[PDB]
Each structure stands twice: as structure tokens, then as C-alpha cells.
Amino acid sequence: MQIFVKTLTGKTITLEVEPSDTIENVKAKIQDKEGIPPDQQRLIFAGKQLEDGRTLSDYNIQKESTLHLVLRLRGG
Amino acid sequence: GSATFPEQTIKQLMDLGFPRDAVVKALKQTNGNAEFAASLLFQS
Questions:
Q1: B17 vs A44: CB contact, 8 Å cut-off?
Q2: What else is known (chain B)?
Q3: How many domains does chain A have?
Q4: Which residue in A68, A69, A74 has the most chain B C-beta atoms within 10 A of its own C-beta, making it the best mutation to test that interface?
Q5: What residue ranges define each of the domains in chain B, with the CATH number in brackets?
Q6: Phi/psi zone of residue A50: left (φ > 0), alpha (ψ -120 to 50 degrees), beta?
Q7: What backbone torsions phi and psi does residue A22 show, to the nearest 5 degrees?
């Protein structure tokens, strides 16, 4: 299935995944293409934060679903 | 104009599934650095 990851730069990252995929694995794919450390990768699903130790099925994430990506740095 | 909150970024942050309230408060403690604001608001 295909999903749409929205970046803080208004970019739409189209990735190939499946319900049986883990959040950690999803972020790993983003990390390879975007070059952003998975530790700073905060995935959001309709305002809800996604746990790395879960699967897409845990949140009933189906095809054509929009996921958000917040770049959480260290500091302020 | 005391527009410390950039319109573009406000919409971007809210589009992530967050209310304007979270944006204002997070931005208030960051001072324009919405990237850090998101890092702050997302710790809840």
C-alpha cells in the first residue's frame, strides 16, 4: 500500500508500506531518502503521536493514509 | 506588525493535526523557531 508523509516543508513523501510494517521500519525508509536521523523523526497520525514499537495495523493505518513528520531537534 | 507567528508555518503545524492553541504557546516559548516549537509541543 502507498502512504503520504507530510513534511514540515510542505513536502509529500510517498512511500510503499503495508499494515504489517513497523513504525521503526517506516522511519528507517524515510531516514534513507531524506537523510534525517530516525531519532529526530516524529511520526503523527491525525494529531496522534505514533510509537516506534508498534505496527501500522495498531492504528489501523490503511492505504492512501496521510502521516505527518515532525523534526524534533535537541534544544530550543 | 507584531506578527511573531508566520502564517505559512502556523498552517503547516496545524495541518499536522494540532490546534492553534498549541502553536501559539509553543511558538511563544520558542520565538519564531517553529521547528523547535514543534519539538516542544510534540513532547506532550
A1: yes
A2: Present with 6510 molecules/cell in log phase SD medium.
A3: 1
A4: A68
A5: 1-44 (1.10.8.10)
A6: beta
A7: -95, 150
- State the Cα torsion A32-A36-A42-A44 to the nearest 10°: -60
Q: Within B1-44, where are the H helices?
A: 7-15, 20-28, 34-41
* Amino acid identity, position A74: R
**Determination technique used:** NMR
Is there a contact between A31 and A13 (Cβ–Cβ < 8 Å)? no
Distance from CA of B20 to the nearest CA of A (A): 12
Tell me whether residues A8 and B42 touch, CB distance under 8 A. Answer: no
Facing A73 at nearest CB: one of B17, B29, B36: B36
Grid coordinates of A61: 493505518
Domain containing residue A17: 1-76
